[PDB]
Design a binder for these strands. Structure first.
Ligand code: CA
Lengths: 69, 69, 228, 69, 69, 276, 228, 138
DNA sequence: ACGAATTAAGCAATTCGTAATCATGGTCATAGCT
DNA sequence: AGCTATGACCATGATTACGAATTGC
């Protein structure tokens, strides 16, 4: 839990203007790549489930947030 | 600061550029508009989304800089 | 005074138009709309010897119907109306004539551009449908040599291109074309047979419904377009 | 206002008995004073002694009048 | 200036005062570079000339010089 | 603001063969009654306050008045900081033509389209210069000619976000505010055309459709700057309540202004012509 | 197609169940309540020649009552409703079939578990009395070897044991027992004599009022217990 | 069974009858819920337990069980303790609204209750409602 | 809109209450007909 | 003397924008 709170504190720190190494480009790249990754996995799950089930254009994904889905 | 922390009023003028100017000139100043250089500028940026002044993602391609001198 | 049943039946329909009235001497009863949109006239068989302005005319009629027909109407001692019954006496306040909106002279109706007639049941059905389907404008026009009346709602259509009601009134042999617009607020005449006269010239138009007892005059909206 | 009635910081001579606004607007309130001029806020303003802010305002007004002439 | 124009866009003020109309253009600004680059650079140069003209007629740089001196 | 409706009447309008003569008499009695009255008033004020000197001078800045021999009203007031005056001689500058000094109305405001602004300014000029009948005829002819104007300038424009909004195959979901419902209608109409779907945060033009439309909605919304597919656009153009927008943006301000000046912008067409 | 006056009365009684009732080609009409707690149907002599869905059926009937019985009702050029009389033409907006909550198919009511007969006078008295005593729940049950119908109150009595109304209905030699109850939002049948049928299984039941003109079906609430 | 198994309500609002969690097979299924009223602290404790059990019945038992338990808890609600049924939201920005112990401009419900408690008896020297604390509202 | 010296994990989301505004049901009052 | 159609009202219902409290990845 100590290590986890440290790691989770890193992302919060990287968005603080008073951080020594703050760069808005870096934080926005992290978060936008998170968005793109979760939606990419969403699309891949949708396609694979459509193939395996045999039907098409069906949204099998209930809902996803960040890493969880 | 010392007069401030003892609650004693300190006179004079606080800002010092004005005091420097007053002592440096004193008399009224005669000027010619030609010698002072005024640069009138504008830029043009092309971007899909509305360009953001704060982050400036897009490139710069058109600059106009008019010099009076 | 002694007012018969027919006179009361006539002037209650007139009371529906204008609450007040200005009963003058003679055998001619007149009413005008407060906003001057409808103007009604009738001739009665009762003698009138003094003039009086009535404000709550409907209550006056309620009192009259409450009492016997041979009740006598007089100028009361307090500058008001006195109703003497066979056994009772009633007092009714007299309104100031300046506070009653009444015509100052009979209106000579000009030469009618169009002449036709409408039956009692036709007008009755028209009024009931008018209350039912929320129509507020009625257009009198021509269609294949026949004069027709249509219903339009100004609230939903200001251009009047949605036919909701339509009736055929009579034949029309001519080439002058017309389309008159009447608001439903002026269609306040009593049920009964009527003769309809239409007059139009430039931006001056009017209509007249004359029945067996009473006559009504209705203004025409400026949106009406005629070719006379 | 600043010129005709001195509102310079140092010309405050003390407080003045404040009446309701209706008394001042209707003229029903008695004459405040003859020695010093007053304002509806109710602070005594010197009449005999000229302030500094109205002096500057008068100087600028005179310069404006001369330059407009 | 004490003038309350309906919109403070450069085109609006230049039209109101200099009475010089901007050359009309087609499409959006972002594609304007790739459609008519000549037109794009000429528009930017005109813009700078229009601000120079409003300065010349109103005479504001001289005003700020007279202020500061 | 002074001189309402008394001084001019007290003397008589018959003394003015020309409106300019009325303006000259205005100047004459203004100079007659201005300096001594204001002088003694502010003298009383400074003496009451017993100040060193008095430095407050009045000066007639703006003079408005209805044009002579016309039924126009000239000047009215709507509310605080909302007023229009038919000014003639502003700060000793005689004008060959009237000047409509207007503040607070929709004319200078850019919420309405430029055509609507021009129409509003013309209506203001009409109510202040000639009067009722001209306002009526102008309103009628503008109603006649409004239907032919481009829909790009006579329709609504609004932002669009949260395109889904619990779509549920056309179901409004979260009370589509008369424009997201139009977005849904446009999406349903263009089904099969392959056009670009509406995205979040896009500016969309909205056109209310006539009641009983095949679209199934009394409004439609397509991305602003674009046009509805001509195939469906012709249909949406056939079903337009130019009236709805007219009563929203144009009829309401005219009604407010006319009732603020004792006027009526819609002809009543009474029977009084036959009454006399 | 023309509608008889009896058809109009039946349509108005059916309008009570739902302000908007759809119509189909044929001579069988049918509807349900918005919440599905009451259903009705009828077999009328007149045959409808076209499908149409009406939203304000009460208003439509009120307008129809203003014309003669020989009025011809048919679809118009724009898919709406048009009523042609001898001299008049009525236009009515045909509603979207989707925006009317109407039953999809006629209900094949199963075999009745219990059968009795309610006289016209009994229902006529009960419906009017229920308003007088503020009775909003009425329960039919088996008591002393017979079937009787007693009314209670619910606003202050959640136990459903405070007895306010009682009515002896008939005899029943049935070993099956039950206490069915109905709210007054479901009692909308017109005055008349009805065969009353009762069905109940699992955890739900229903009651049926079949008549010489129309049939009604009413739901049985949660407290309607049955021991079959 | 007749249980739904799992259901959703909105973004970050869902309830699931989890059987295994990270390769940990559970002897009996246990409820996993994120967002609804049984995790929101502001909802009352007794209400928390009641609606948590109702959610469990929804996810495992079925409609009839939900109706039966709703009726049972409707019966049970009247004779419960006052402290265990209340919203427990915090309070902030004290000087925005207070006057004579009465609500001010845009006074929230909990703050209105706080001011009413101020008017209640007072003068006993009990701890105040200074911001950062938690208060039950009734 | 120039105060001027300075400082400390982030965002997306629901849900409720309050304040503003428009549409309307139940009921009362008016009244009109019988 | 009473039923009933309709305007007013008084509150009620409904929708919108904004502040606030609380999760949760
Ligand atoms: Ca997780």
């Amino acid at each position: 839990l100590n290590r986890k709170i440290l790691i989770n504190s890193l992302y919060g720190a990287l968005g603080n203007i008073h951080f020594r190494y703050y760069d808005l480009r870096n934080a926005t790249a992290i978060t936008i790549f998170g968005q793109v990754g979760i939606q990419w996995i969403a699309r891949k799950i949708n396609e694979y489930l459509n193939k395996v089930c045999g039907t098409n254009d069906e949204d099998f994904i209930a809902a996803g947030d960040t890493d969880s889905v | 600061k010392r007069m401030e922390d003892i609650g004693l009023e300190a006179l004079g003028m606080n800002d010092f550029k004005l005091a420097y100017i007053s002592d440096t000139y004193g008399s009224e100043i005669v000027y010619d508009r030609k010698f002072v250089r005024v640069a009138n500028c504008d830029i043009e940026v092309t971007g899909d989304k509305f360009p953001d002044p704060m982050k400036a993602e897009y490139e710069i391609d058109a600059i106009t800089h008019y010099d009076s001198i | 005074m002694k007012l018969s049943k027919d006179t009361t039946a006539l002037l209650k329909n007139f009371a529906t138009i204008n609450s007040g009235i200005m009963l003058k001497s003679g055998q001619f009863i007149m009413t005008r709309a407060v906003n001057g949109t409808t103007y009604a006239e009738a001739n009665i068989s009762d003698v009138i010897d003094f003039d009086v302005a009535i404000y709550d005319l409907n209550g006056f009629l309620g009192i009259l119907s409450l009492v016997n027909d041979d009740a006598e109407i007089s100028q009361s001692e307090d500058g008001n109306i006195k109703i003497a019954d066979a056994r009772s006496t009633i007092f009714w306040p007299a309104a100031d004539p300046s506070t009653v909106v009444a015509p100052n002279k009979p209106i000579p109706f000009p030469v009618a551009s169009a002449v036709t007639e409408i039956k009692a049941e036709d007008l009755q059905q028209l009024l009931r449908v008018s209350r039912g389907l929320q129509i507020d404008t009625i257009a009198i026009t021509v269609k294949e040599g026949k004069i027709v009346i249509n219903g339009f709602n100004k609230v939903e259509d200001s251009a009047l291109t949605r036919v909701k009601y339509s009736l055929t009134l009579g034949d029309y042999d001519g080439e002058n074309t017309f389309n008159f617009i009447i608001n439903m607020a002026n269609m306040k005449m009593q049920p009964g047979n009527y003769k309809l006269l239409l007059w139009a010239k430039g931006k001056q138009g009017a209509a007249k419904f004359e029945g067996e007892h009473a006559n009504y005059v209705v203004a025409l909206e400026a949106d009406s377009t005629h070719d006379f | 206002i600043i010129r005709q009635v001195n509102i310079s910081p140092e010309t405050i001579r003390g407080q003045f008995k404040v009446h309701p606004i209706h008394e001042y607007i209707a003229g029903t309130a008695p004459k405040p004073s003859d020695e010093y001029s007053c304002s509806p806020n109710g602070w005594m303003y010197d009449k005999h002694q000229e302030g500094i802010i109205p002096k500057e305002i008068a100087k600028v007004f005179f310069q404006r009048k001369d330059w407009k002439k | 200036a004490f003038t309350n124009l309906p919109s403070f866009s450069l085109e609006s003020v230049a039209q109101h005062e200099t009475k010089k109309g901007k050359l009309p253009y087609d499409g959006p600004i972002n594609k304007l570079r790739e459609t008519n680059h000549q037109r794009y650079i000429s528009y930017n140069i005109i813009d700078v000339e229009s601000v120079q003209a409003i300065d010349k007629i109103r005479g504001f740089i001289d005003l700020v010089l007279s202020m500061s001196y | 603001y002074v001189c309402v409706d008394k001084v001019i009447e007290k003397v008589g309008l018959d003394r003015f063969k020309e409106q300019n003569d009325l303006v000259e008499f205005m100047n004459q009695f203004g100079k007659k009654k201005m300096e001594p009255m204001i002088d003694v008033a502010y003298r009383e004020l400074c003496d009451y306050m017993n100040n060193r000197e008095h430095l407050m001078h009045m000066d007639r800045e703006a003079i408005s008045c209805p044009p002579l021999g016309s039924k126009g009203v000239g000047g009215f007031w709507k509310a605080k900081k909302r007023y229009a005056l038919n000014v003639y001689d502003m700060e000793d500058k005689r004008f060959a033509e009237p000047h409509l000094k207007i503040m607070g109305m929709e004319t200078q405001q850019s919420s309405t389209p430029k055509a609507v602004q021009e129409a509003l300014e013309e209506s203001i000029r009409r109510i202040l210069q000639e009067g009722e009948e001209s306002v009526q005829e102008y309103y009628k002819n503008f109603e006649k000619e409004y239907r032919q104007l481009d829909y790009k300038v006579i329709a609504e424009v609004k932002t669009a976000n949260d395109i889904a909004k619990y779509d549920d195959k056309g179901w409004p979901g979260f009370k589509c505010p008369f424009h997201i419902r139009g977005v849904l209608t446009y999406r349903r109409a263009v089904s099969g055309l392959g056009v670009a779907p509406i995205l979040d945060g896009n500016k969309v033009m909205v056109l209310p459709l006539r009641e009983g439309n095949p679209f199934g909605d009394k409004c439609i919304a397509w991305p602003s700057g674009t046009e509805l597919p001509k195939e469906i656009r012709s249909d949406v153009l056939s079903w337009i309540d130019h009236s709805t927008l007219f009563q929203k943006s144009f009829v309401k301000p005219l009604a407010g202004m006319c009732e603020s000046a004792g006027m009526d912008y819609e002809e009543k067409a009474s029977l009084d012509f036959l009454f006399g």
